[model samples]
Target chain A: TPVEEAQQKTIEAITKAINYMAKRRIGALLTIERDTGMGDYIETGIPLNAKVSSELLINIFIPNTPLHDGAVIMKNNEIAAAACYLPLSESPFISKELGTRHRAAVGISEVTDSLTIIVSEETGGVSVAKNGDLHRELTEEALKEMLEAEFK
Target chain B: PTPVEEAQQKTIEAITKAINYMAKRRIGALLTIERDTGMGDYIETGIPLNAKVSSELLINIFIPNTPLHDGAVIMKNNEIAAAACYLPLSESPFISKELGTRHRAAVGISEVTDSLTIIVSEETGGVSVAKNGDLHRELTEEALKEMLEAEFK
Candidate 1:
């Protein structure tokens, strides 16, 4: 029961967090911990761990929360920072309406070789960015494969 | 080929491939092959795998950060006996000062048991073997095959 209990707890939190982020079309960004460099770029103003819970994520991205402004960078599924300032986009060719969050996702990926997940609140679309390209409108199945590659 | 010789050859080939692949990738791994000596003590110190040996399985067990990657993989009768096992450190002052824990442990295990340890160092993607308390470094495939052949004999 204890093994199942710990697993059930993990499953519940992850499931609920992901579901909430999806249904509400919440704006979120996830950048992986990659080959180190430019570490000073992301400002870790609000630090929190437990990259462990559904309730944790829901509370952080509630639109006007203090920690809602920046992306959550993670390592091995642990939320290393709750508020990390990602670099703003510098590319000139992106759509005028794509916005700052989208630009930041692109910016971070350019130098760090990071895999970035971006949720556009205005268009309410989810996308992944890396290698200076935005892979927009990702499906649940495709996202699944991306995650397996993400942690490994 | 004779059946018994064929078995030894196949196992060595698997070990060769596994060692070569890890060396090419510059990954660190320590593998101990149990001979006449009892490795149950070492196996009990780690997680029981008891699976048939293959280069792919051997490689997977050493893939970085996985549960089994951090420690030793004990091979018994040419199958994986256990994984993530800790080996003793060789206190011999004669060991090269540059050798680290992995190399040190290989010699230590060899000192007490009739086991041969294959050690792959990530530092220079080098291959080495430890047997009878001696660490033979920078061995070519030919040398490795000879060493393995002696074990089978």
Candidate 2:
């Protein structure tokens, strides 16, 4: 699948970026839209070049910057948009402990097949939300494998 | 300072950060800042980014072996107007034998426009400025900032 192949290359960079963000405890929310035209988004028009996108991501997520405010949406290996607002899941299944990032990830997952990679600002944890289920505390390796399994 | 000065200062800092880092690493780069003259034709010649003036992104733009690294990055209204763009060459009868294409392009664009260009030599790692059809070579970090301040003001 073109989407899957595009996603693998895209996810490869995404993992490195959000993983570094994890080590530094920076907040990052990246949404991989399974299908376009299914959700609301803002357009950024930046391609996900493997050589530079990782470095670009680090700067984009730098706290207090304008681009850091919202989720980075990826579609067909391109940065479709940043500073986006996604629907928040209000399921009672979500723990009160979860923050807005997780809710938004889970919220978008329930409505579409998109996968959201989340980095916790407070705990330096990496998590993913897909198909309405949230996988928390994933090691870098685990997260990569999970992403590969799906995006592949 | 006035709000206009403040905006220019912001761009100055952004350019400074990128220049200093690339110089330290000996990465080749040519940056053009558009002033009164709109570089519409040249901007159309390259890839339109229209992104913010950011340090890391600028550094990445000129990083070796990338799609946009080969040509100049044009900045207009403090935003990145385009990259890998073409600029006219100086038909000057005399140019320094030591300066390369990057420096020539710097001087070339400055010849026709009142724009400021920053050139970092990949071979020498020296910083130079081109303006008013003249190239100022081997500018120190302080001197570069002073030049930028004068231009922005």
Candidate 3:
């Protein structure tokens, strides 16, 4: 029951945090670790290993922060690592407009079954990547729905 | 024969030849076949071969004297795409402690992609298949042939 409750709490906080980031036009990359252990990627980051919360996530993604450029990795509904380097997608099919951040999100998803969320700095648009597919320009409701489906 | 059927036959033959060659000499080998997901990231990890699959080539690559013997061979569209490619090791707690680096790499590649990995053991001349994060050990020639046919189709 604690695990389920913790997941519910994470979903609520992340949904709010994503909306906050999009509103302030703060670019963000968040990867929710799935069945695949992202240990290889976590090694590339500064370890947070902190509890998950909206405030912490908001602060990490604030513009000009060192951690802002890289991804924050969440494992088991908690922040396992931050400022993690992700593989850049080499797929020729990716759009020209998508930058390194979006490509990293897609790239990480391709190797692992992790769910990656991205907030574009240019457009503040929220997108989710899973199983090597990117779903862009999500509404708040859509983002929340995705979190529910994946976390549940 | 149709182009599709011809390609399928080629793949089957390739698999059979490669397996028999490795088995006879007790050559340890790791080979991964790409599926729907592109293996560009993995391919970039190795020395690009870009050659057609053949028993002689596979055996030569896996021979103990070759520098590339330790790494994996990647096949795409029934052709060898790269050689000596590194694969991520599985972090699963369930993995057997006895499994060697080659066996682990086979399972590791399978865990990351939809790819099917074939591993031949030099010590025991055993053939194994790793797919969808599960390893099937000691596959017979008939079993390997059946699995290859299913994968090609």
Candidate 4:
């Protein structure tokens, strides 16, 4: 329950943050710590230790625009960064807001529990990872708040 | 070829390949040379020929995706890494051990042995020293040196 709660909390935090950013019509960059202990970068060939790798994501949204462009996430400490495609475009209610939904889905899962499946290009397409899974999402509010977190 | 001799020959070739590959690349891989889970050893890539380094098998390696670059990055960060390969080793004089020998001996053994050793790993702020024994904590190159030095002494 703790991990589940933690996962939910992480998702809530990220989504709330994303929405704020999206409302302001801006993009947000998220940085998460990479586990460099044992089995860290075991995915990467170098079996050496004491290295830190981070995952970064760029979240942005455009309103009233059917042109949803989801490019690759590159240039960061992440050994790999890929995403799932949410076919919100085909869905009437969410068609106009496909971009937000796709990103939010990613962000929610990255911080939360595992099994955060991204809607891939294929119908109902999804992928899973064992550990170090980064689920990132972009939202209007999330965009603005991402720049500076207000902690009381 | 006899099955036992064949297995031995295959292993010998493997060791040769391991050594030559490591030597050409110049590194220490922490691989499994023994039967135990974590009983590991290093294959030195640059040991002196005169050294009576034994042909003891200690670890096995699961080939990594890529080989690392020159170890200067880790050596620069952790002096212990330099000390491990360059510092005086625990050697028996009558057994052909040299004093003040560079740590190249370890490197050479790693070249010939089976451990998948590391220099300075970026994942941890230290050396990413891995032995085929077990994928343990992130030990910097300096930390690895200290541990090994302590063990040998």
Candidate 1 regions off by >4 Å?
A: A1-152
TM-score of chain A of 1: 0.79
* TM accuracy, model 4: 0.21
Q: Give the best candidate by TM-score.
A: 2
The whole-model lDDT of each prediction reads 0.74, 0.80, 0.81, 0.29
Best-fitting candidate, scored by lDDT: 3
Docking class of 4: incorrect
lDDT of 4: 0.29
**How well does chain A score by TM in each candidate?**
0.79, 0.86, 0.96, 0.26
Ranking by TM-score: 2, 1, 3, 4
What TM-score should be assigned to candidate 3?
0.49
Clash count of each predicted structure: 0, 0, 0, 73
Task: Tell me how far the alpha carbon of residue A143 in candidate 3 is from the true structure, in angstroms, after superposition.
Answer: 0.9
Models ranked on lDDT: 3, 2, 1, 4
Q: Which CAPRI tier for candidate 1?
A: incorrect
Candidate 4 segments exceeding 4 Å error: A1-152, B29-91, B94-153
Q: What value does DockQ give for candidate 3? A: 0.01
TM-scores of chain B alone in all candidate structures, in the order given: 0.95, 0.95, 0.93, 0.27
Candidate 1 residue B12 C-alpha distance from true site, Å: 0.6
- Give fnat for candidate 4: 0.00
